[PDB]
């Protein structure tokens, strides 16, 4: 972009006396000093350019309120910006700064300051001069510690310091009582200050990917929290009565932390939570009656744990919609499962299940049932009642035959039967009118396919690898699933139709 275009637009802005000037996305390398004349400017946009400095004449724009400089190559700012006593927003993201430019600390009128994607390493104590600051985003820098003077930003509402190197938070942060969004994820925090509980207005607290070994109990004062995501830390236990005090908390994630037992605090500590994710831990037992007050608990994720049995109150979980028990040590499913009348998704992959209970047939709302990597010897006949079942994954088991009720899963689109010991498919496979995918790969004893498989008019993916299929002609089997479906139509009773 030629500079002469920029000069012409600058003249156009002068004549129009536009309170707004937008020079963004013009690959400007250097800016003309004539900018001095545009004293009427209240908004100046310069984002997505190649600027490496600003001219000191920018400080002449004493009426300027918004200055957007993001997505540049700046390393400093001219000291003349101190004249902008009306500047409310300063945007300096993706800009290759190594320190907050000193002139920024003197802009006592700022309410919004963006410094993302820069190589800033510390916030100096002069941050207190920005007493009117309500938005501070110093995300994605190399900051190792925050100054205690951060606590004088009493008007701060959102503090976004994610993807930094904070080891501890300054205890003074509690004096910022108007904070509602505190993003601290992808840091190296080792503990949280007890004064965090003074942020009584806090609704969003981002803590995942840090190194916290515990949570302060004073956090229980932050009753405005709606989501507590504590993923990827060392938390092994929660403070007693922490959960039961967060009466707005609807999403709890305690994943990838070192929990061996469920959090202490009794059934009342889950009474307001829609979703509980406790994956990748070492919990070996779900306590009896733990969800007795969890009237709105819909999603329970227990993947990658050490559950050896389900609690005997399992059937009481009427409200449950999605239950994930994958990568555990379960040897059986209690008949009580029939109480889960609202259950829609049941993930049981990577367990030690040999049989499924009769009660599996009462899961009238079950749509997805994943049973991959178990030791299943057979399917119960009641499988025929899962009329809303759409996905039935049975890969890597010891299944040998399918019950004739399998054809009653009229809503089934996915039937995964890979890595099993199947000898035949039942002829009722042909009533799966909506069957779209049928995986039969690695069935060493599947020597034939029923003619009725030709009635599955939507079947669009089928795996036959490492199946003998010896009752089918060698040329047809080598021709792939297209030729086998064609062969079963024309040699079967359904050709003339």
């Amino acid at each position: 972009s030629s500079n002469a275009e920029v000069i012409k637009e600058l003249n156009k802005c002068r004549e129009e006396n536009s309170m707004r000037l937008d020079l963004s996305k013009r690959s400007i390398h250097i800016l003309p000093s004539s900018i001095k004349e545009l004293t009427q400017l209240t908004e100046l946009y310069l984002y997505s350019n190649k600027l490496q400095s600003l001219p000191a004449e920018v400080g002449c724009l004493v009426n300027l309120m918004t200055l957007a400089l993001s997505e540049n190559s700046l390393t400093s700012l001219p000291d003349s910006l101190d004249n902008l006593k009306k500047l409310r927003m300063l945007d300096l993201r993706h800009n290759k700064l190594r320190e907050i430019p000193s002139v920024v600390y003197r802009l006592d009128s700022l309410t919004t300051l963006y410094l993302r994607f820069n190589r800033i390493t510390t916030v100096e104590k002069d941050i207190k001069n920005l007493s009117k600051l309500s938005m501070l985003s110093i995300r994605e820098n190399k900051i190792k510690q925050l100054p205690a003077e951060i606590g004088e930003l009493c008007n701060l509402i959102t503090l976004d310091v994610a993807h930094n190197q904070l080891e501890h938070l300054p205890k003074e942060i509690g004096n910022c009582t108007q904070i509602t969004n505190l993003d601290l994820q992808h840091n190296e925090l080792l503990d949280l200050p007890d004064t965090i509980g003074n942020l009584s207005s806090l609704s969003r607290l981002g803590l995942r990917y840090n190194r916290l070994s515990a949570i302060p109990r004073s956090l229980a004062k932050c009753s405005a929290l709606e989501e507590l995501n504590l993923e990827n830390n060392n938390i092994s236990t929660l403070p007693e009565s922490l959960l039961s005090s967060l009466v707005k908390l609807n999403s709890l994630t305690l994943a990838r932390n070192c929990f061996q037992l469920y959090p202490v605090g009794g059934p009342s500590q889950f009474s307001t939570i829609y979703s509980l994710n406790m994956e990748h831990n070492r919990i070996n037992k779900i306590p009896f009656g733990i969800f007795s007050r969890a009237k709105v608990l819909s999603k329970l994720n227990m993947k990658d744990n050490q559950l050896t049995s389900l609690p005997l109150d399992f059937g009481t979980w009427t409200s449950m919609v999605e239950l994930n028990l994958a990568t555990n040590q379960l040897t059986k499913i209690p008949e009580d499962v029939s109480g889960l009348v609202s259950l829609e998704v049941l993930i049981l992959s990577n367990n030690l299940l040999k049989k499924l209970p009769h009660g599996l047939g009462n899961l009238r709302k079950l749509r997805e049932l994943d049973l991959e990597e178990n030791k299943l010897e057979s399917l119960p006949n009641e499988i025929a009642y899962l009329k809303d079942l759409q996905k039935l994954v049975l890969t890597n088991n010891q299944l040998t035959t399918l019950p004739r009720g399998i054809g009653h899963l009229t809503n089934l689109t996915h039937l995964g039967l890979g890595e099993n010991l199947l000898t035949h498919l039942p002829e009722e496979i042909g009533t799966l009118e909506n069957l779209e995918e049928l995986y039969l790969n690695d069935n060493p004893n599947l020597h034939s396919l029923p003619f009725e498989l030709a009635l599955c008019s939507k079947l669009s993916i089928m795996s036959i690898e490492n199946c003998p299929l010896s009752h089918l002609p060698p040329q047809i089997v080598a021709g792939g699933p297209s030729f086998i479906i064609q062969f079963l139509k024309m040699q079967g009773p359904y050709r003339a139709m």
Side-chain angles (χ1 to χ4, degrees):
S1 297
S2 175
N3 193 25
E5 332 169 358
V6 179
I7 298 171
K8 186 180 178 181
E9 209 291 0
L10 285 165
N11 296 336
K12 151 194 171 182
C13 175
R14 173 175 48 182
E15 294 151 2
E16 290 170 348
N17 217 51
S18 185
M19 298 186 294
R20 176 176 175 124
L21 175 61
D22 195 337
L23 294 179
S24 66
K25 298 172 176 162
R26 287 182 188 205
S27 302
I28 310 180
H29 298 253
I30 311 181
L31 194 71
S33 61
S34 62
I35 188 67
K36 49 188 172 181
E37 314 146 4
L38 306 191
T39 63
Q40 79 287 353
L41 281 178
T42 64
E43 304 181 18
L44 178 57
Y45 298 84
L46 288 165
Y47 63 90
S48 307
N49 280 305
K50 301 179 183 178
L51 296 168
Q52 300 181 22
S53 60
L54 292 180
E57 289 89 357
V58 174
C60 300
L61 308 182
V62 297
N63 291 308
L64 203 73
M65 300 189 189
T66 299
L67 179 53
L69 296 161
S70 64
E71 301 170 34
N72 276 284
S73 285
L74 296 171
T75 54
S76 65
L77 295 174
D79 284 314
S80 61
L81 261 73
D82 200 353
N83 293 334
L84 308 186
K85 299 305 189 189
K86 296 186 188 172
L87 195 74
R88 298 188 182 204
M89 181 185 286
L90 178 58
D91 183 8
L92 287 160
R93 308 167 295 182
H94 272 277
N95 222 324
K96 216 187 299 297
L97 300 164
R98 289 178 165 176
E99 81 214 28
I100 303 178
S102 65
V103 68
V104 179
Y105 298 115
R106 303 192 295 273
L107 307 174
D108 63 15
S109 60
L110 281 177
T111 63
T112 301
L113 179 59
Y114 299 121
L115 291 154
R116 196 183 151 267
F117 229 83
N118 296 309
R119 313 171 187 180
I120 299 163
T121 54
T122 59
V123 178
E124 300 185 345
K125 61 178 183 180
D126 296 304
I127 194 68
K128 64 182 178 180
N129 298 333
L130 310 187
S131 59
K132 296 180 190 153
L133 201 71
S134 69
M135 174 67 178
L136 181 57
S137 178
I138 43 189
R139 192 192 175 93
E140 306 231 37
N141 306 335
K142 322 186 168 179
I143 299 170
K144 292 210 171 198
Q145 63 185 16
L146 298 177
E149 292 85 353
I150 200 72
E152 299 185 44
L153 303 185
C154 301
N155 289 307
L156 203 66
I157 298 175
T158 299
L159 181 57
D160 179 21
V161 306
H163 293 273
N164 279 271
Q165 300 167 330
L166 305 185
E167 225 183 354
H168 307 268
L169 266 194
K171 194 126 151 160
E172 286 81 7
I173 197 59
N175 309 340
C176 303
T177 59
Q178 292 196 81
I179 290 176
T180 59
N181 294 261
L182 184 57
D183 282 301
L184 300 159
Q185 63 276 36
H186 298 95
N187 274 282
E188 293 161 355
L189 293 175
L190 305 173
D191 60 352
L192 296 173
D194 277 332
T195 53
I196 198 70
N198 296 352
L199 306 184
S200 56
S201 308
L202 192 70
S203 62
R204 185 186 185 188
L205 181 56
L207 290 169
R208 63 167 207 188
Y209 288 92
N210 281 254
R211 282 146 214 193
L212 312 167
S213 47
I215 292 296
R217 57 179 314 177
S218 63
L219 189 65
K221 297 177 182 179
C222 302
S223 59
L225 281 174
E226 293 181 5
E227 184 185 349
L228 179 59
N229 189 339
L230 301 168
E231 208 184 1
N232 286 277
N233 296 275
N234 215 337
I235 309 172
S236 59
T237 186
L238 294 180
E240 191 173 9
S241 308
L242 170 61
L243 292 182
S244 56
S245 305
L246 302 178
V247 300
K248 290 194 179 184
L249 190 68
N250 60 60
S251 181
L252 176 60
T253 300
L254 296 172
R256 310 181 191 266
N257 297 347
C258 301
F259 275 86
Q260 298 187 199
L261 298 172
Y262 258 71
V264 296
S268 40
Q269 84 184 327
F270 298 115
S271 57
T272 51
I273 305 194
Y274 300 148
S275 160
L276 176 57
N277 179 4
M278 292 177 72
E279 71 180 346
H280 297 262
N281 303 341
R282 283 186 152 155
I283 302 167
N284 63 14
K285 186 173 181 177
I286 305 180
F288 177 91
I290 197 60
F291 303 137
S292 61
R293 294 186 175 198
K295 295 187 178 184
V296 299
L297 178 65
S298 293
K299 306 187 176 223
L300 176 59
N301 183 4
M302 291 291 295
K303 174 178 176 180
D304 198 348
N305 269 281
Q306 299 179 1
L307 295 175
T308 56
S309 55
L310 298 174
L312 311 146
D313 73 309
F314 186 57
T316 69
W317 310 355
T318 69
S319 54
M320 196 69 70
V321 178
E322 299 176 3
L323 176 59
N324 189 343
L325 293 169
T327 317
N328 273 278
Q329 301 172 49
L330 298 172
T331 54
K332 61 180 181 176
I333 301 302
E335 288 294 340
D336 303 341
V337 68
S338 55
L340 284 65
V341 299
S342 301
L343 202 71
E344 293 186 26
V345 181
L346 179 55
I347 311 301
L348 286 169
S349 40
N350 198 337
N351 271 279
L352 303 175
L353 301 175
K354 294 189 178 191
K355 298 185 181 184
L356 301 173
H358 295 284
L360 191 74
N362 291 162
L363 303 183
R364 298 301 178 155
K365 298 188 184 177
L366 198 72
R367 293 182 181 169
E368 179 168 1
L369 178 57
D370 180 12
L371 290 163
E372 178 169 18
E373 294 205 24
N374 273 276
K375 301 185 181 182
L376 293 174
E377 295 163 6
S378 65
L379 299 177
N381 288 329
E382 293 74 13
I383 198 76
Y385 293 167
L386 306 180
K387 293 300 187 159
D388 290 355
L389 196 69
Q390 313 180 9
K391 186 172 169 181
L392 181 54
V393 195
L394 295 161
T395 309
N396 197 352
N397 273 278
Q398 302 177 15
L399 297 173
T400 51
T401 65
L402 299 176
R404 289 187 178 183
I406 201 75
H408 293 173
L409 305 182
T410 51
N411 296 13
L412 205 74
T413 81
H414 189 253
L415 187 49
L417 292 157
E419 300 178 59
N420 273 275
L421 303 174
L422 293 175
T423 61
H424 64 315
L425 298 176
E427 302 168 347
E428 293 84 355
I429 199 75
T431 65
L432 306 184
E433 296 179 1
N434 292 305
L435 192 69
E436 296 178 12
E437 310 187 41
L438 183 64
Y439 293 86
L440 298 165
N441 49 294
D442 301 85
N443 267 274
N445 303 331
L446 196 58
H447 295 259
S448 63
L449 293 162
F451 297 116
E452 289 70 18
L453 186 63
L455 305 176
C456 299
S457 62
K458 298 193 193 174
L459 186 67
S460 71
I461 296 173
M462 174 176 178
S463 284
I464 57 174
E465 295 82 345
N466 308 329
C467 298
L469 298 178
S470 58
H471 295 183
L472 299 179
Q475 302 83 6
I476 296 298
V477 183
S482 306
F483 277 62
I484 291 178
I485 295 297
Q486 187 179 6
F487 178 86
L488 293 175
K489 284 181 181 185
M490 304 308 301
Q491 307 293 323
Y494 315 113
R495 42 184 149 188
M497 310 311 172

